[PDB]
């Protein structure tokens, strides 16, 4: 089995920076992952994006610092070759 763990703050702060933790298990091959803040609900616009590497060197964990500046919700998206996972996040101004 190959599983992933995505960690994020509950409500996204508009203006302030947020840390998004990605952890992967069951992988021995090194690969890249993209963590992005995208529009709700069609993902037509991307606000902030961060590419992270996952390998044996960093123990298959990484994070990206992402922010949103001036809408009720955004999408947090984590994409790679092996998985694609999105979560709807509420925002406060």
């Amino acid at each position, epitope marked *: 089995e190959q599983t992933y763990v995505i960690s994020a703050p509950k409500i996204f702060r508009v203006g302030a920076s947020e840390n998004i933790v990605i952890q992967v298990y069951g992988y*021995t*091959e*090194a*690969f*890249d*992952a*993209t963590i*992005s803040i995208k529009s709700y609900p069609d993902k037509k616009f*991307s606000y902030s*994006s961060g*590419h*992270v*590497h996952l*390998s*044996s*060197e960093n123990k298959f964990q990484n994070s990206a610092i992402l922010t949103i500046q001036p809408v009720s919700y955004v999408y947090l998206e984590v*994409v*790679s*070759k*092996h998985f*694609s996972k999105s979560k709807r996040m509420p925002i406060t101004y």
Partner: antibody
């Protein structure tokens, strides 16, 4: 997806080689595993090294370590190879190659450039 | 780096033959293996990715198999366009591996 090599030709012995690879048809949403592959006349394919376009994570062959530097650019989508202290042994056709990003599950070289001939001679 | 051993180095075959080319890795790489075709004066072309998946555009006669250390490229009904040199490559990215190509297998016209 198209890959164009530039910066090949005649290199003097001892000098530093620098090759650029420009990629077309790359999406910003995905990271790409871009490699350099060389082939001497009448010989097989030799993997020099590679870089992920997203994170900038560098991977190299054990013979290439200490001599080879592979660098990246985000907006330009250009990957640059640098090889220090060139020798007649390094005379080869140098290929820029790439995977298909997150669309395909493996790091196989799906796309290949035309290749540029590098001749190391005095 | 990982070593990829190809056997044989060269083989003689006719149009319509079933051709078997083997690739052997020095350590286990699961399904992370690609097959390439190269004609003289031309850039290499991907045939098989992920050990057993044929790339779109590549004819169905080309098929890959194997997992772990031993891998096999099969061409069922050999065509005039199939005469070339064939390379296997480990595609597993990592500091302990490297994306090493095999020595190559030249498929030559038997007479």
């Amino acid at each position: 997806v198209q890959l164009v090599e530039s910066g090949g030709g005649l290199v003097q012995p001892g000098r530093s080689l620098r090759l650029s690879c420009a990629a077309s048809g790359f999406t910003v949403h995905s990271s790409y595993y871009m490699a350099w592959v060389r082939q001497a006349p009448g010989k097989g394919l030799e993997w020099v090294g590679a870089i992920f376009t997203g994170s900038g994570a560098e991977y190299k062959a054990e013979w290439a370590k200490g001599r080879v530097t592979i660098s990246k650019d985000t907006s330009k989508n250009q990957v640059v190879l640098t090889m220090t202290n060139m020798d007649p042994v390094d005379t080869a056709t140098y290929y820029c190659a790439s995977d298909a990003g997150y669309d395909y599950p493996t790091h196989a070289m799906h796309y290949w450039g035309q290749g540029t001939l590098v001749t190391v001679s005095s | 780096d990982i070593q990829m051993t190809q056997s044989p180095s060269s083989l003689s075959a006719s149009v319509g033959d079933r051709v078997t080319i083997t690739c052997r890795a020095s350590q286990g790489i699961s399904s992370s293996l690609a097959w390439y075709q190269q004609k003289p004066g031309k850039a290499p072309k991907l045939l098989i990715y992920g050990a057993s998946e044929t790339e779109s555009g590549v004819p169905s006669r080309f098929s890959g198999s194997g997992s772990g250390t031993d891998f096999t490229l099969t061409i069922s009904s050999l065509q005039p366009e199939d005469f070339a040199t064939y390379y296997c490559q480990n595609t597993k990215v990592g500091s302990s591996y490297g994306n090493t190509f095999g020595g190559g297998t030249k498929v030559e016209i038997k007479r």
